[PDB]
């Protein structure tokens, strides 16, 4: 019986972020009507806020899959808060025309305003305009009446960056600032798809970054401890996972039984 949920419905992505903590282990995505069934179960178990993530949410079916679930959550389930977290690179303006009215919040991952740092940490596909893309997406959120947030992973390569003026110029509703998180089997392990150890920062370095940006009123910190205690993952099979063997899928045992495992 949860209030908010992070639904990582896909693990496919077009970027290669070196620290990615939710890696391309599978290509499975549920049939649309199976996801719709699980989302309804969550609604009936008392869900109020849903956040679509991955993976890159806009990759599947050029965003139409995501748009259909977004519309189902707002129209059919009457969820008062529907959000997406995206790297932003595959978002088409046409998506906003077709689905934007159902979307409350679009959070775009941007870890640096230094386009060298962004290419280095893997946040791109080659064009090295990932930050110029950000102002276009900000403008689309303004024009299509979607709240715009920025997600940043604080890591070895941006820990001393001063982002104050850049974040202020974008005027996001929120700037969610995550300490780089290690998850064994995801970005840690000899067989893992990423090895994030070299990206990690200490709690002291993280706190120093927050203090440097204390003038940014919309800043919301997400330390390692906060993520481990409060960030709940519903994976691409609609099994529950935490950030510290997955549960049974809610599609098989229900929300109550599945939440007990995690
Ligand atoms: N090692 C790590 N520690 C903390 N946050 C991480 C992380 N790896 C990824 N994230 C963040 O988790 C969120 C979901 S990742 C999937 C959403 C989308 N592909 C995107 O990049 O925006 C993103 O903000 C991402 O940058
Ligand atoms: S963190 Fe980077 S590699 Fe990981 S899913 Fe988001 S854009 Fe893709």
Curated annotation (Swiss-Prot):
Chain coiled-coil ranges: none
Distribution of this protein across tissues and organs: Expressed at higher levels in atherosclerotic arteries than in normal arteries.
Residue ranges annotated for the Radical SAM core domain, each copy included: 1-219
Gene Ontology CC terms, in alphabetical order: endoplasmic reticulum; endoplasmic reticulum membrane; fibrillar center; Golgi apparatus; lipid droplet; mitochondrial inner membrane; mitochondrial outer membrane
Bilayer disposition of the protein: Peripheral membrane protein
Induction trigger: By interferon type I, type II and LPS. Induced by infection with Vesicular stomatitis virus and pseudorabies virus in dendritic cells, presumably through type I interferon pathway.
Activity modulation comment: IRAK1 and TRAF6 synergistically activate RSAD2 increasing its activity with CTP as substrate about 10-fold.
Post-translational modification as stated in the protein's UniProt record: Acetylated by HAT1. HAT1-mediated acetylation of Lys-127 in turn recruits UBE4A that stimulates RSAD2 polyubiquitination leading to proteasomal degradation.
Family: Belongs to the radical SAM superfamily. RSAD2 family.
Name listed for the protein in its UniProt record: S-adenosylmethionine-dependent nucleotide dehydratase RSAD2
Organism for this UniProt entry: Mus musculus
From-to range in the entire protein, with total length: 72 to 337 of 362
């Amino acid at each position: 019986t949860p209030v908010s949920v992070n639904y990582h419905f896909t693990r496919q992505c077009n970027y290669k972020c070196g620290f990615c903590f939710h890696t391309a282990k599978t290509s499975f995505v549920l049939p649309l009507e199976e996801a719709k069934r699980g989302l309804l179960l969550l609604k009936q178990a008392g869900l109020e806020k849903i956040n679509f993530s991955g993976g890159e949410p806009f990759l599947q079916d050029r965003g139409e899959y995501l748009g259909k679930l977004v519309r189902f959550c707002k129209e059919e389930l009457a969820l008062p808060s529907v959000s997406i977290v995206s790297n932003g690179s595959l978002i088409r303006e046409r998506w906003f025309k077709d689905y934007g009215e159902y979307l409350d919040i679009l959070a775009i991952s941007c870890d640096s305003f230094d386009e060298q740092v962004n290419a280095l940490i893997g946040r791109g596909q080659g064009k090295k305009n990932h930050v110029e893309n950000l102002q276009k997406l900000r403008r689309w959120c303004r024009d299509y009446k979607v709240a715009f947030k920025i997600n940043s992973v604080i890591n070895r390569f941006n820990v001393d960056e001063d982002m104050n003026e850049h974040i202020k110029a974008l005027s996001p509703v929120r700037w969610k600032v995550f300490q780089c998180l290690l998850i064994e089997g995801e970005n840690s392990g000899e067989d893992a798809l990423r090895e994030a150890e070299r990206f990690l920062i200490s709690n002291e370095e993280f706190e120093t970054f927050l203090e440097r940006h204390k003038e940014v009123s919309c800043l919301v910190p997400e330390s390692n401890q906060k993520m481990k205690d409060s960030y709940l993952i519903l994976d691409e099979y609609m099994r529950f996972l935490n950030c510290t063997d997955p549960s049974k899928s809610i599609l098989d045992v229900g929300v109550e039984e599945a939440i007990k495992f995690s």
